[PDB]
Design a protein around this motif. Structure first.
Motif: not given
Length: 192
Positions: A25-30, A143-144, A153-159
């Motif tokens: 849920e943190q992915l789509r957030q600042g 998640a990183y 941009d909270n800097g959270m990314r998913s790969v």
């Protein structure tokens, strides 16, 4: 008299499900004033703390999880709900916040170096030399934190593991051949 506060195997499984859900849920957030530090250790502490909260209507609305199939609620003691507020700091000292080194050193145990054996919410620990990092194994993705947050941009990314293998930056490959990949660690308060 009174043993050490941990989650039993069933509680641990439900904690992992909540941990990964909150992380996703943190992915789509600042930036959130709710993380203690704008980095990987900040995200892990946040997701663990939120995973152990009573997930009432107010909490669901605040975290945008109001209309969802969610993991089961845990029947936890207050002491158990406080587990991500009471990290080991070394030398028996305790505190509410943790950086990456203190989290792995005093608050985790090795699973191994094979993602096949990782469970959702296990931590992928890297040492790039000057700087150490934690990624979260989400079960089918990673998640990183980019290492650089901005006001939007909270800097959270998913790969995916697949897309991570395509990276020209080969320093993040989670296998034997990567000397910067130290291991996969489980939060110490989870059952084995």
């Amino acid at each position: 008299g009174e043993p050490a506060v941990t989650l039993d195997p069933q509680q641990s499984q439900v904690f992992r499900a909540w941990f990964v859900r909150i992380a996703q849920e943190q992915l789509r957030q600042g930036p959130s004033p709710r993380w203690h530090q704008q980095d990987c250790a900040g995200l892990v502490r946040f997701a663990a703390n939120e995973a152990l909260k009573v997930h009432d209507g107010k909490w669901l609305r605040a975290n945008g999880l109001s209309n969802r199939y969610l993991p089961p609620e845990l029947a936890l003691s207050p002491e158990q709900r406080r587990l991500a507020q009471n990290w080991q700091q070394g030398g028996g000292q305790v505190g509410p916040y943790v950086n990456a080194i203190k989290l792995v050193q005093f608050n985790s145990r090795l699973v191994g170096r094979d993602l096949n054996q990782a469970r959702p919410g296990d931590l992928m620990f890297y040492d790039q030399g000057d700087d150490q990092h934690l990624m979260i194994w989400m079960g089918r993705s990673i998640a990183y934190h980019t290492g650089s947050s901005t006001p939007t941009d909270n800097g959270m990314r998913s790969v995916s593991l697949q897309q991570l293998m395509t990276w020209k930056d080969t320093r993040w490959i989670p296998d034997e051949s990567n000397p910067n990949f130290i291991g996969i660690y489980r939060l110490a308060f989870l059952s084995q």
